Short mmCIF file of C-alpha atoms in Angstrom, two decimals:
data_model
loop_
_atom_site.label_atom_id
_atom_site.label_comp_id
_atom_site.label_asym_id
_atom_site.label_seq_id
_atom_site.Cartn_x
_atom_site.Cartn_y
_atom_site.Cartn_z
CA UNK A 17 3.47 0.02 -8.53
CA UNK A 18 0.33 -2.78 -8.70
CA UNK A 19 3.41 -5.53 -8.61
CA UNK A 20 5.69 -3.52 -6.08
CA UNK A 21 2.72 -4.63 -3.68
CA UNK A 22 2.75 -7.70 -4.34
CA UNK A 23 6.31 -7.67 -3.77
CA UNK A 24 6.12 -5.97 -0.63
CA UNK A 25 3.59 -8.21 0.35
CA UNK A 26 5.78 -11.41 0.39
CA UNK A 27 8.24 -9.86 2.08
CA UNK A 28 5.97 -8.65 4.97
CA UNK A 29 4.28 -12.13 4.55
CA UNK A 30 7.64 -13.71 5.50
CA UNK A 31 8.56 -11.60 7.99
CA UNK A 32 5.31 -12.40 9.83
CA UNK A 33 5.79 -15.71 9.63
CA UNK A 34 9.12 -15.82 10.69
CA UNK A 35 7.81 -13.63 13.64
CA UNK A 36 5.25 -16.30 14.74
CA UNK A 37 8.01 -19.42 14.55
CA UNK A 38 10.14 -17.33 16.55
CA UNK A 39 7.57 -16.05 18.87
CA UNK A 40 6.42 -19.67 19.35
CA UNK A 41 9.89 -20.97 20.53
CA UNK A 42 10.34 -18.43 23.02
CA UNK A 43 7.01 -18.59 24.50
CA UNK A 44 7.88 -22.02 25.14
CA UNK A 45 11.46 -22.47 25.67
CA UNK A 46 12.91 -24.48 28.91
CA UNK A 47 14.64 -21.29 29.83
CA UNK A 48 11.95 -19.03 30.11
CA UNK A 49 8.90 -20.48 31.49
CA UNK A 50 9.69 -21.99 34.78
CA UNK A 51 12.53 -22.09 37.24
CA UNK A 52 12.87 -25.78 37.09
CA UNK A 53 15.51 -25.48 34.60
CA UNK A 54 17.37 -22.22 35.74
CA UNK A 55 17.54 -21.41 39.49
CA UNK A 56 17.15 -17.86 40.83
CA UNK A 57 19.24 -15.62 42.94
CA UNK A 58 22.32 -18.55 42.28
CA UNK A 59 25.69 -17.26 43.00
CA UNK A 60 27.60 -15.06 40.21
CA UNK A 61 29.87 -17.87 39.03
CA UNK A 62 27.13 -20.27 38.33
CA UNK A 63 25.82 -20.68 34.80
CA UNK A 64 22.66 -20.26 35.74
CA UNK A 65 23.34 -16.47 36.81
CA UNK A 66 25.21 -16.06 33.71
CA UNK A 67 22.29 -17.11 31.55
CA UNK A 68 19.72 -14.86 33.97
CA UNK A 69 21.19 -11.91 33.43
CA UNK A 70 21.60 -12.09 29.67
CA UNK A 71 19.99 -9.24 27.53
CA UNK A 72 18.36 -12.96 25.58
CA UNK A 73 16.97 -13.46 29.03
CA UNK A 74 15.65 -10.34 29.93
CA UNK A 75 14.18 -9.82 26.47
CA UNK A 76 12.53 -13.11 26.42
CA UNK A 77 11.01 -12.69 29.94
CA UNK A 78 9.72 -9.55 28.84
CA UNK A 79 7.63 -10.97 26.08
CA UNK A 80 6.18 -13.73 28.37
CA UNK A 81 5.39 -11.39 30.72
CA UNK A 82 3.76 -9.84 28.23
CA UNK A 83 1.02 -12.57 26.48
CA UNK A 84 -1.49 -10.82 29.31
CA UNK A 85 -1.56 -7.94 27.12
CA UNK A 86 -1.05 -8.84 23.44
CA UNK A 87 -0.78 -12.65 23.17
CA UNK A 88 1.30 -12.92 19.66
CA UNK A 89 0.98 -16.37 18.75
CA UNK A 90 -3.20 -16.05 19.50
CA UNK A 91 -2.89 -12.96 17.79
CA UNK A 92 -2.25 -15.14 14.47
CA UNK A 93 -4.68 -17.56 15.41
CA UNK A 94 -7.49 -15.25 15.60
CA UNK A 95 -6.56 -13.89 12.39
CA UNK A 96 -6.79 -17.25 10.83
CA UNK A 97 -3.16 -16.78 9.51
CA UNK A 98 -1.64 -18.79 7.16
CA UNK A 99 2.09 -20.20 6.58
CA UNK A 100 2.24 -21.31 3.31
CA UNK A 101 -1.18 -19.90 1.87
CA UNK A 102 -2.43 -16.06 1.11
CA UNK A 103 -5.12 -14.53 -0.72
CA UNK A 104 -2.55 -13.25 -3.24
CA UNK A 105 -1.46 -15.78 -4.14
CA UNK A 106 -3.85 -15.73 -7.04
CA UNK A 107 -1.77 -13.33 -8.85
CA UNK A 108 1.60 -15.02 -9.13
CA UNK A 109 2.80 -18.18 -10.58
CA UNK A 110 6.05 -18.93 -8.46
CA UNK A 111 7.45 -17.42 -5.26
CA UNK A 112 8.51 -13.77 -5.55
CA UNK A 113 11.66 -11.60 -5.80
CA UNK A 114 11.17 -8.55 -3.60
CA UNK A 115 13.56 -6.37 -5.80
CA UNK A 116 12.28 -6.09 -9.30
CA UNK A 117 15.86 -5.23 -10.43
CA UNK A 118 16.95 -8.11 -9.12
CA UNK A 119 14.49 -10.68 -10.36
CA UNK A 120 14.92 -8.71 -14.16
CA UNK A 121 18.64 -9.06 -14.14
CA UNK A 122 17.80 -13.03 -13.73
CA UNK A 123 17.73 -13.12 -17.08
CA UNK A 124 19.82 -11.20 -18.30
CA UNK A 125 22.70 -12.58 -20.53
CA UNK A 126 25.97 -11.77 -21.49
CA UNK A 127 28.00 4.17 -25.66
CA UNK A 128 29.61 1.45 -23.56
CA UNK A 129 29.88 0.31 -19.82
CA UNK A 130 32.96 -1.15 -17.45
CA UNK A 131 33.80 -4.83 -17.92
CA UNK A 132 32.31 -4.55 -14.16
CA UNK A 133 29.93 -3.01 -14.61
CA UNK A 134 29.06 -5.19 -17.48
CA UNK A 135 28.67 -7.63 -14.79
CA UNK A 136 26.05 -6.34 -13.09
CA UNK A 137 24.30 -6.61 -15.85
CA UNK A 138 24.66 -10.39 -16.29
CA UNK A 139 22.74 -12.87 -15.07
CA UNK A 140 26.34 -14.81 -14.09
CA UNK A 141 27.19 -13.81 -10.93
CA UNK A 142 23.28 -14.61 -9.82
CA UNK A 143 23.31 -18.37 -11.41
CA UNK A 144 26.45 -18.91 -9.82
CA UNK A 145 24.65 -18.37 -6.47
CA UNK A 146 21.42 -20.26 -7.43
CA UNK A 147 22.88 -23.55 -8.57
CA UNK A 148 24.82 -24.09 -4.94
CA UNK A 149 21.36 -22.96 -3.29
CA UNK A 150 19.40 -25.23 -5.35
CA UNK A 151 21.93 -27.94 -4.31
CA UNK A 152 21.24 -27.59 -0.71
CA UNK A 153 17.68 -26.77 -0.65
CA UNK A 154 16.87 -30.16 -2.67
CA UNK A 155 19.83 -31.90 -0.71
CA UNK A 156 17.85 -30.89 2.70
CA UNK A 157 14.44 -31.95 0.88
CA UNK A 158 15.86 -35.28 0.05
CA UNK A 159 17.36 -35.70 3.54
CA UNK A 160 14.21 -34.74 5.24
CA UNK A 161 11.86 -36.79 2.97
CA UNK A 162 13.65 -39.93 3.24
CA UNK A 163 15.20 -40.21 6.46
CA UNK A 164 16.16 -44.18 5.59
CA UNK A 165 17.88 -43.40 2.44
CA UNK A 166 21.79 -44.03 2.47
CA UNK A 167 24.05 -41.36 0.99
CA UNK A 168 23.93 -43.12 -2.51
CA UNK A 169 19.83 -42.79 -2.53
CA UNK A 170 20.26 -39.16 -1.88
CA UNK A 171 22.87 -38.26 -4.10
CA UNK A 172 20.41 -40.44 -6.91
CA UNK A 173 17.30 -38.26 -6.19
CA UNK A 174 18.82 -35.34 -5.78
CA UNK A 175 21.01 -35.38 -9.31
CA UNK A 176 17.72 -36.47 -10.63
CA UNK A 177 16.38 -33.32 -9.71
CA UNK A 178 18.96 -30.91 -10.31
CA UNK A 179 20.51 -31.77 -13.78
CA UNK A 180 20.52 -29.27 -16.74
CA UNK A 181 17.66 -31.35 -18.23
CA UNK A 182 15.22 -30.85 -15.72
CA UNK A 183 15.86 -27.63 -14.93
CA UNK A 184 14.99 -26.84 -18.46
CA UNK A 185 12.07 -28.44 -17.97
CA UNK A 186 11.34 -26.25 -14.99
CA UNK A 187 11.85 -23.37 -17.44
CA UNK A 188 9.25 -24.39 -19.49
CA UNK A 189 6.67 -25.10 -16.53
CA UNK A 190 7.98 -21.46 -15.23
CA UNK A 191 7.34 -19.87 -18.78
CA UNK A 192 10.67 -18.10 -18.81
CA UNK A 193 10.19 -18.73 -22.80
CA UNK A 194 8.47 -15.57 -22.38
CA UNK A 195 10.54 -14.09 -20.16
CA UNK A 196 13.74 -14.01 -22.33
CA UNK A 197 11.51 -12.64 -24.78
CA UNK A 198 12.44 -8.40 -25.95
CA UNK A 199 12.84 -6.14 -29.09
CA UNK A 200 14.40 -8.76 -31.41
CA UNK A 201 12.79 -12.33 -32.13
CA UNK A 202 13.66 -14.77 -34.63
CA UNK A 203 10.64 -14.93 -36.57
CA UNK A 204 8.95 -18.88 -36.89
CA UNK A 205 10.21 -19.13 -40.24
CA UNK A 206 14.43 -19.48 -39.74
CA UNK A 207 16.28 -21.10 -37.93
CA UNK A 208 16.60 -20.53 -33.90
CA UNK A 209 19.50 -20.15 -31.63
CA UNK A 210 20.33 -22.57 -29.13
CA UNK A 211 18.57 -21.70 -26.34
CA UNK A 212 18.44 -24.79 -23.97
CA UNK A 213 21.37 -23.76 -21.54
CA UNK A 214 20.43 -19.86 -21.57
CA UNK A 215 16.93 -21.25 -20.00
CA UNK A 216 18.60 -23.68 -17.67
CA UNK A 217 20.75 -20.71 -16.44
CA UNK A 218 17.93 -18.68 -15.77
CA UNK A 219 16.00 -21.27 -13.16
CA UNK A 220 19.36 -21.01 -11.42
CA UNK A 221 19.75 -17.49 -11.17
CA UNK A 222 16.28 -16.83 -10.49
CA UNK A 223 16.67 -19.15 -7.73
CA UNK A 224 19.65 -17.25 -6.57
CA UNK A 225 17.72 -14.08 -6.97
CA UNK A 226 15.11 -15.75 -3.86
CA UNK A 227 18.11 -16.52 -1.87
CA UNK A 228 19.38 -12.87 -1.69
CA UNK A 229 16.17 -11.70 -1.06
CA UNK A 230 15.26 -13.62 2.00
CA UNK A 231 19.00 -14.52 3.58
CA UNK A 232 18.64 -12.90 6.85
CA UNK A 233 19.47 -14.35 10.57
CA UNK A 234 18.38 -17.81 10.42
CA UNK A 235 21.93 -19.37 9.66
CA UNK A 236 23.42 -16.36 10.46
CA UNK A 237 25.47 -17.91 13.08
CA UNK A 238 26.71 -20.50 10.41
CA UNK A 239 27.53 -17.78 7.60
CA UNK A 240 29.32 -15.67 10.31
CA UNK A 241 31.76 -18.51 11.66
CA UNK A 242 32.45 -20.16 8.02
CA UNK A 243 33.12 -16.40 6.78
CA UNK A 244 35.99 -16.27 9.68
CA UNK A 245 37.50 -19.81 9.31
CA UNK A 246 37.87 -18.23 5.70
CA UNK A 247 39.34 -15.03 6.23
CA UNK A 248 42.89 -15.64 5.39
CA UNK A 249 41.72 -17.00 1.69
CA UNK A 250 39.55 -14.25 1.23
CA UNK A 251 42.13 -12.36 1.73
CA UNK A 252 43.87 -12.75 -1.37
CA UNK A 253 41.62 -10.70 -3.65
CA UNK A 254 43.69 -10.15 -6.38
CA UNK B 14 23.08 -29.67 32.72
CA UNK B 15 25.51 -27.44 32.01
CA UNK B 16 26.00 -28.53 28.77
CA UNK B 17 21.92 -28.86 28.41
CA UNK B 18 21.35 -24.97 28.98
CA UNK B 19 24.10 -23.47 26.75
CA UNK B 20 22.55 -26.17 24.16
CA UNK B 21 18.94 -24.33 25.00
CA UNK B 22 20.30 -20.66 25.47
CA UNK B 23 21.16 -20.45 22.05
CA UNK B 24 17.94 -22.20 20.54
CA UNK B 25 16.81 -19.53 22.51
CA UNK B 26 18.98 -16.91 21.85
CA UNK B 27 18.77 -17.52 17.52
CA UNK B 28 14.78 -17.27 17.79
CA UNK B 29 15.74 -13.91 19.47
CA UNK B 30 17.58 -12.57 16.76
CA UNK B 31 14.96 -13.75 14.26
CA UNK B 32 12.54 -12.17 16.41
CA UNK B 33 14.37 -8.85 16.27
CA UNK B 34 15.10 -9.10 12.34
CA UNK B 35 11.45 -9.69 11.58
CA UNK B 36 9.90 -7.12 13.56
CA UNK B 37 11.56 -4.46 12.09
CA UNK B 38 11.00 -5.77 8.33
CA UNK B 39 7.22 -5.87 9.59
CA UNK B 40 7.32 -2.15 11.48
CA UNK B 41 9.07 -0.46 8.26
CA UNK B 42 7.02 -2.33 5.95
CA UNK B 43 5.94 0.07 3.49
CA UNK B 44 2.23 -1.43 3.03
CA UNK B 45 1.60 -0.84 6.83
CA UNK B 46 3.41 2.60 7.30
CA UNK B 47 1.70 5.50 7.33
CA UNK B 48 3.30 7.32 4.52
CA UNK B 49 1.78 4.84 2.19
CA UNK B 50 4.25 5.66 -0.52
CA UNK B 51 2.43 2.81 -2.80
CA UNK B 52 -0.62 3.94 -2.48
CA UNK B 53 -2.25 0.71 -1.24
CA UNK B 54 -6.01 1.25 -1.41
CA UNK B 55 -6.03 4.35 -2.92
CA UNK B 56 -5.52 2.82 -5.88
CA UNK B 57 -8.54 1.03 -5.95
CA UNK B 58 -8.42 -2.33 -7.98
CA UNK B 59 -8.29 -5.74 -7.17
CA UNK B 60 -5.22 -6.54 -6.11
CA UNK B 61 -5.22 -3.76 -3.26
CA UNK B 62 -8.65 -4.93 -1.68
CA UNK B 63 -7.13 -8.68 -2.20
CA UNK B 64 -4.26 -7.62 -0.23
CA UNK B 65 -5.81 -5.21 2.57
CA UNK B 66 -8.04 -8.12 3.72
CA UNK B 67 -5.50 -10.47 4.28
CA UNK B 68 -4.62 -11.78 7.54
CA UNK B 69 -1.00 -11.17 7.17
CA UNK B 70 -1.93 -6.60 6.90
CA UNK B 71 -4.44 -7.46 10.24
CA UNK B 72 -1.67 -8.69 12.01
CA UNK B 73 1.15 -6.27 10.93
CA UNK B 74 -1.38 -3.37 11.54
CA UNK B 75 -2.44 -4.79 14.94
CA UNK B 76 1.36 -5.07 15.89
CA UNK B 77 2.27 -1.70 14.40
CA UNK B 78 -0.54 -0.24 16.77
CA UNK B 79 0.93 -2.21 20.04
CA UNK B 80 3.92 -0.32 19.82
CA UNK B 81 3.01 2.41 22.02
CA UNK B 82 2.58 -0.61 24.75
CA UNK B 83 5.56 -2.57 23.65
CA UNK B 84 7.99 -1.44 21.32
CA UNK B 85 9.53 -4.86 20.34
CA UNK B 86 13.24 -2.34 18.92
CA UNK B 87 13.09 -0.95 21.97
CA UNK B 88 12.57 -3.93 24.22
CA UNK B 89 15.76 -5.17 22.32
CA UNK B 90 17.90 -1.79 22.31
CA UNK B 91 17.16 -0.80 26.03
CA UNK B 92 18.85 -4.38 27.17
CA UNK B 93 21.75 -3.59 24.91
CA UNK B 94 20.61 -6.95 22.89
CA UNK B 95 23.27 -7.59 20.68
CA UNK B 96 23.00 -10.26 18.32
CA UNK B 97 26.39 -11.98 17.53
CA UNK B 98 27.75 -11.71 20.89
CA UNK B 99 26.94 -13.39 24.23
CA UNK B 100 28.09 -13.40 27.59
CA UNK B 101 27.49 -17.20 27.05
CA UNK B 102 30.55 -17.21 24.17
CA UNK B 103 32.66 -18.11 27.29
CA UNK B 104 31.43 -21.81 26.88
CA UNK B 105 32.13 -22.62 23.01
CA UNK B 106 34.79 -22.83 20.73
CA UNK B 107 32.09 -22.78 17.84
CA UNK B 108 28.62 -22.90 16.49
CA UNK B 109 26.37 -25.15 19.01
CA UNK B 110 24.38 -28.06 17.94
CA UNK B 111 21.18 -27.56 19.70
CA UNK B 112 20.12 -31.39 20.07
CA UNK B 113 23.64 -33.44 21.52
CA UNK B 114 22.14 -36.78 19.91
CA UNK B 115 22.78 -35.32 16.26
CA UNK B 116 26.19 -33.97 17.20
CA UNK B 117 27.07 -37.35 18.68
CA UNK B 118 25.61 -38.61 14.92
CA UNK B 119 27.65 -36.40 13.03
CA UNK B 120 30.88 -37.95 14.86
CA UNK B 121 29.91 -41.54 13.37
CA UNK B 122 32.09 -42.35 10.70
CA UNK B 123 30.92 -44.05 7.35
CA UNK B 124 31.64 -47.95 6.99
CA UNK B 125 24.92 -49.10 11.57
CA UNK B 126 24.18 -45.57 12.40
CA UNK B 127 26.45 -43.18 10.42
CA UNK B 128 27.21 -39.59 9.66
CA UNK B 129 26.77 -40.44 5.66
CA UNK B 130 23.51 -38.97 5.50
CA UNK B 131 24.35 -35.48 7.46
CA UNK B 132 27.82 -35.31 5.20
CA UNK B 133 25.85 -35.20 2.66
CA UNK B 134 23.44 -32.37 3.03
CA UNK B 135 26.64 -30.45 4.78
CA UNK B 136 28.60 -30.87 2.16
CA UNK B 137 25.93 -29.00 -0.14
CA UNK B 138 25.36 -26.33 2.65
CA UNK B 139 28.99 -25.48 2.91
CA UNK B 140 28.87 -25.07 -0.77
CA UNK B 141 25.98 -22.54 -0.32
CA UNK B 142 27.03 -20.45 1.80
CA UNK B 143 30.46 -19.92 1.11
CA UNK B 144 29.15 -19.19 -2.45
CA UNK B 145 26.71 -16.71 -0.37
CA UNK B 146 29.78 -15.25 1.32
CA UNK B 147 32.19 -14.71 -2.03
CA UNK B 148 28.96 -12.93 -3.83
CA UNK B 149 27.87 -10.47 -1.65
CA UNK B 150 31.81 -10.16 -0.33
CA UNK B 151 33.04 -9.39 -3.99
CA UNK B 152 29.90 -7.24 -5.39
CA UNK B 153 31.85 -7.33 -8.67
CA UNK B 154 34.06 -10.47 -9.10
CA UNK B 155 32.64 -12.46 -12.11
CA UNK B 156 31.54 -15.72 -12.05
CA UNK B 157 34.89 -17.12 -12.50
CA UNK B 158 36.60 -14.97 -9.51
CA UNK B 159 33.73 -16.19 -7.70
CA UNK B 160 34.23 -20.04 -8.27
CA UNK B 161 37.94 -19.84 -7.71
CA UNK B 162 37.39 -18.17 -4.21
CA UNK B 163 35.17 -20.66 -3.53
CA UNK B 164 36.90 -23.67 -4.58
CA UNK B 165 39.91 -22.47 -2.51
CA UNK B 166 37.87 -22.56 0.63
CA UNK B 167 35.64 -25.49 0.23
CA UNK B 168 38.28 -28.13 -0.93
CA UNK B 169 39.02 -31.35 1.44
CA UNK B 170 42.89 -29.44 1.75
CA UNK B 171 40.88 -26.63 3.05
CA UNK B 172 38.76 -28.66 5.36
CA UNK B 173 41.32 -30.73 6.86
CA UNK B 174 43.08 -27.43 7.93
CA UNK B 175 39.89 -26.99 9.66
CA UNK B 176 38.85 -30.08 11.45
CA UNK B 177 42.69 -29.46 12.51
CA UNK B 178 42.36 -25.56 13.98
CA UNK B 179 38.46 -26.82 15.08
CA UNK B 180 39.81 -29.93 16.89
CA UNK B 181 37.53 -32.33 15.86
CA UNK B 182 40.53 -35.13 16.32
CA UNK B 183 41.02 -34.29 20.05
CA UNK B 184 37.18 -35.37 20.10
CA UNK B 185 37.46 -38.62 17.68
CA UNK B 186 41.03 -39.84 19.56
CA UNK B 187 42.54 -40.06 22.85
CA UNK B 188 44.12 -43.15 22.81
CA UNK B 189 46.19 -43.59 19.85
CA UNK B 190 48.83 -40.86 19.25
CA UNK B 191 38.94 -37.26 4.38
CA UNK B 192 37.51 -38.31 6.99
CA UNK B 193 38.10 -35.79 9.27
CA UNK B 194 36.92 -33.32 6.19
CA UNK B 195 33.41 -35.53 6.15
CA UNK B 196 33.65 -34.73 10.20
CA UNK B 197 33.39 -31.07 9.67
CA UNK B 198 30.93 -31.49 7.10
CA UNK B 199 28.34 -33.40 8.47
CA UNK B 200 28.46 -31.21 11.56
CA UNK B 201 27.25 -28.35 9.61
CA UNK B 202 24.66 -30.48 8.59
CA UNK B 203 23.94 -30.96 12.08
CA UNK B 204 23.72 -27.07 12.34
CA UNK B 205 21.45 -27.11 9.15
CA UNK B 206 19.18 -29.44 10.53
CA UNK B 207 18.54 -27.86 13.79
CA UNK B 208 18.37 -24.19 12.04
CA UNK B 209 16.43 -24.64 9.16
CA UNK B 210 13.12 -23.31 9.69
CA UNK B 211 10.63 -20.07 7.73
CA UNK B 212 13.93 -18.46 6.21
CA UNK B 213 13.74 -20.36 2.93
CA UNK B 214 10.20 -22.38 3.57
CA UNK B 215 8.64 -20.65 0.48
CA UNK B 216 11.36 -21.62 -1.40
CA UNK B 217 11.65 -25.08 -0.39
CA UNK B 218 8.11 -25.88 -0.80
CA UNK B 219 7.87 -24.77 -4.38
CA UNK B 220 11.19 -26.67 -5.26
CA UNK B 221 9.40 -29.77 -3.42
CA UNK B 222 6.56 -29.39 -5.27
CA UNK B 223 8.22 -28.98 -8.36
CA UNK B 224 10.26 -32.09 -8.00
CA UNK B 225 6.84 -34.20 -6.84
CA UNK B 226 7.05 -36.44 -10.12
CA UNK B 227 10.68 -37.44 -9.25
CA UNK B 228 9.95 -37.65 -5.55
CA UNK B 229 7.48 -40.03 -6.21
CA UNK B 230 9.44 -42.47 -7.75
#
């Protein structure tokens, strides 16, 4: 219950500050503000009626009309909100999953139970999603960082990054040692298991465990029109 | 002009949708309801106090309190808001780029300014959300199911099918009668670019932090 807070937390941290970005572009935005970008009372077939009379429109208009009353980006401001910064932060050592199922079946490996449902209960399906999200999150931190690099550069730092080495070396920083830890240990004495991929695994599915917590509408657009150019392949589910 | 304001409508239109998704996760929260099903404060240790002082619960309280002003669901609902359709539509034949320089970029073939760069990071988003879109599409393929789905969509076969259907050549000829994959690449990497904003912030600053040492270098 103490860490369900926590974990609730985050996720209504997040939420507020994807509230203030968004409330911050559409206080501002061309569209909205004046009329020197979108003329009134134009005729029907003009874009500018078209764009006027959108629910976005009236919404948006509606909340500017509104900063009399509750202004939401000073509302922040006098609340000396932070982005990237909280109080709690004190009590955690990396960014939080908001389902604890989720973050528990991160590592997770390999009466009985349904090869699929077997599946849930494996930590596969999870690093799977991880590693491409890793891929892209360091590929757009590379990109932004260096914005002189050539392809080759980026492709360097990145794979220095993202390779099975270093990522066990995150492990080890992350403490998931003690994680993968349950009934049964091998004592100091004999002779361990190989356990350098298991760890590496788990970064990447922990990882992927973030991304299905916080995917919402930012790149829903994207996710949308990619998951129709693919419909006819993901079709044959067989 | 035109072009300009359906390029700004949806900038506009995305923080919209945002707006809408967050504002409900922040009315429903269960640390601001009323119910208080985990007994925030109640409980009485550190953590609690830690978190009932924060500036993130003085917001959420003060907005959960303005909704008898201005109920941000029903501000949506009552203009029949609906988030993946527009009467704009009419204009595209896909996802727009909102700033026309970095579409123009992502056009620029490879060997100057070039697309290189914007293949690049595309390339890796692709990858990421198609694997998004095969794992929460097939709640019970394994991780071998998963890859081969995957690799069936994001191959350069794949992607030349789709530069063709998109028609990305009637934009790079006129005249005459992979890299048309790279093409459709770095243009999601244009769309990546001019997206990426809180969504996966927390994220990307630990991962940047994390990789410091090698950034460095």
């Amino acid at each position: 219950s103490n860490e369900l807070k926590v974990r609730e937390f985050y996720r209504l941290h997040n939420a507020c500050v994807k509230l203030k970005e968004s409330i911050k572009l559409i206080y501002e935005n061309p569209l909205v503000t004046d009329q020197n970008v979108l003329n009134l009372g134009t005729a029907e077939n003009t874009i500018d009626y078209t764009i006027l009379n959108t629910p976005t429109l009236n919404v948006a208009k509606t909340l500017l009309g509104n900063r009399y009353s509750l202004d939401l980006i000073d509302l922040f401001q006098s609340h000396d909100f932070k982005d990237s910064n909280t109080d709690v932060d004190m009590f955690i050592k990396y960014p939080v999953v908001y389902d604890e199922n989720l973050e528990n079946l991160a590592f997770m490996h390999k009466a009985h139970l349904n090869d699929a449902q077997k599946t849930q209960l494996s930590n596969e399906r999870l690093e799977f999603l991880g590693d491409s999200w890793l891929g892209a999150l360091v590929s757009y931190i590379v990109y932004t960082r260096f914005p002189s690099a050539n392809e080759g550069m980026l492709s360097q730092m990145k794979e220095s990054i993202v390779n099975n080495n270093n990522l066990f070396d995150w492990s080890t920083k992350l403490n998931f040692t003690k994680r993968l830890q349950g009934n049964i240990a091998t004592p100091t004495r004999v002779v361990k298991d190989k356990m350098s991929k298991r760890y590496a695994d788990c970064v990447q599915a922990y990882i992927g465990a973030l991304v299905i917590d916080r995917f919402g509408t930012e790149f829903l657009d994207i996710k949308e029109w990619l998951e129709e150019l693919s419909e006819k392949k993901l079709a044959k589910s067989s």
